[PDB]
Design a protein around this ligand. Structure first.
Ligand code: OGA
Ligand code: NI
Ligand code: ZN
Lengths: 11, 455
């Protein structure tokens, strides 16, 4: 879904 | 073959060739106070926030100047509004503000570790509160005698039922700051882009970090600090974005989708002015179009944010540049710029001549591209069905490359949509590919000619 989010690195 | 005409750039002209002294390498952040409530509704305010020269702006104590009921966004108000609502979590390492280090503090590094996980709001509220009480204890001793943190990020207050009073409150804002507004490009998308044209909530603890970025498609951002702690902001003017991206390349981190915390000395070393400022409870941050920024919580606090699309030439030009650049980089543009431009021309009167010429150019190119695509499909014996747009039909995207697909849709089967390349390359002659047309040449042509400059 177009959605705004934070970059990620693990998980 | 761009949707942009280089001659029409309204981008401010900035010379980095000349050496720059340090005082200008630390520009003052435009802070604005609102004695009257109608000041907030003044056009000069909007002119100010959207001025290209003004990368970022703080509106001081606006949440009292209009009597916004922030208290509602208090963690307590939230937990009981719905605690078993859910939340993305970042696990991070707590550090001083202007710094990010390897495991030992030998070196400053660009890569910012930010691992991901999930909880509920009620659960993160526990954590946020426990965390605060703990820091309290370690101070109620001294009196009488690596930190791992979790950041609650991009929490979606989209459900206008559940979050009714919270959302209703933000109606009290000047139109250009609102979630939904006739003058908001993002209100003309025809569907929901979570976090852009809906509200996101941030639950932070001290050290809680949002790493370097520009907004999706270079859209303005509006952030309010709920309290009770502060936030520290860093920001650079769009002009310098490629220089920052270059750093990301050298340090092996993707600029657009990677996690990175800039090395301030690098930026000073590169002659790049950095805005540094503190955002206090009830302070609103306005991030102008294309501004590189990154953010640290210094206390315990929640923020609220969403993206706005004011109808200015600057905002528009930058939305398009990022739209094209995204596809050069194989990165999904979540604001379907071409579908938006047509929606805007068809629903909104435009008085600003520079913005008008930009939308007009884009529509033209959209028509030529639709025209070219039609001939060669005809020319090669391909039949094209006519499909209507229905009411509240969304924009489409290539199931494969994520590019926006406009007007002409390639489809397979439980049905999938593709751009032409992805359809061919998956069938040489487009066999088993239905092709749909949503706007006949004449629908677009008439819409185009109907589109004129308002005085
Ligand atoms: O509030 C934060 O932690 C980060 N927010 C933003 O970068 C924004 O609203 O544009
Ligand atoms: Ni941001
Ligand atoms: Zn494709």
């Amino acid at each position: 879904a177009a959605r705004k989010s934070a970059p990620a690195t693990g998980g | 073959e761009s949707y942009l005409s280089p001659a029409q750039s309204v981008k401010p002209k900035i010379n980095t060739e000349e050496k720059l002294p340090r005082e200008k390498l630390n520009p003052p952040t435009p802070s604005i106070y609102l004695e009257s409530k109608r000041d907030a509704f003044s056009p000069v305010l909007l002119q100010f926030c959207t001025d290209p020269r003004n990368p970022i702006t703080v509106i001081r104590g606006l949440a009292g100047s209009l009597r916004l009921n922030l208290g509602l966004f208090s963690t307590k108000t939230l937990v009981e509004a719905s605690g078993e609502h859910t939340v993305e979590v970042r696990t991070q390492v707590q550090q001083p503000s202007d710094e990010n280090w390897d495991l030992t503090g030998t070196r400053q590094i660009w890569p910012c570790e930010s691992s991901r996980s999930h909880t509920t709001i009620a659960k993160y509220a526990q954590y946020q509160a426990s965390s605060f009480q703990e820091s309290l204890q370690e101070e109620l001793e001294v009196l009488f005698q690596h930190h791992i943190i979790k950041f609650g990020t991009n929490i979606d207050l989209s459900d206008a039922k559940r979050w009714k009073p919270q959302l209703q409150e933000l109606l009290k804002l000047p139109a250009f700051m609102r979630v939904t507004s006739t003058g908001n490009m993002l209100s003309h998308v025809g569907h929901t882009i979570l976090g852009m044209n809906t509200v996101q909530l941030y639950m932070k603890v001290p050290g809680s970090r949002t790493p370097g970025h520009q907004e999706n498609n270079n859209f303005c951002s509006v952030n309010i600090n709920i309290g009770p702690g502060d936030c520290e902001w860093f920001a650079v003017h769009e002009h310098y974005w490629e220089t920052i991206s270059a750093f990301c390349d050298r340090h092996g981190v993707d600029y657009l989708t990677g996690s990175w915390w800039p090395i301030l000395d690098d930026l000073y070393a590169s002659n790049i002015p950095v805005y540094r400022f503190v955002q206090r409870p009830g302070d609103l941050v306005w991030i102008n179009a294309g501004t590189v920024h990154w953010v640290q919580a210094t206390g315990w606090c929640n923020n609220i944010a969403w993206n706005v699309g004011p109808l200015t030439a600057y905002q528009y030009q930058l939305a398009l540049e990022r739209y094209e650049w995204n596809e050069v980089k194989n990165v999904k543009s979540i604001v379907p710029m071409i579908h938006v431009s047509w929606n805007v021309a068809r629903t909104v009167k435009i008085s600003d001549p520079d913005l008008f010429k930009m939308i007009k150019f884009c529509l033209l190119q959209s028509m030529k591209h639709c025209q070219v695509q039609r001939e060669s499909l005809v020319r090669a014996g391909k039949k094209i069905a006519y499909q209507g747009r229905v009411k509240d039909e969304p924009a489409y995207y290539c199931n494969e490359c994520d590019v926006e697909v406009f007007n002409i849709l390639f489809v397979t089967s439980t049905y999938l949509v593709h751009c032409e390349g992805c359809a061919r390359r998956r069938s040489a002659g487009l066999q088993g590919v239905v092709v749909l047309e949503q706007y006949r040449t004449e629908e677009l042509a008439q819409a185009y000619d109907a589109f004129t400059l308002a005085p």
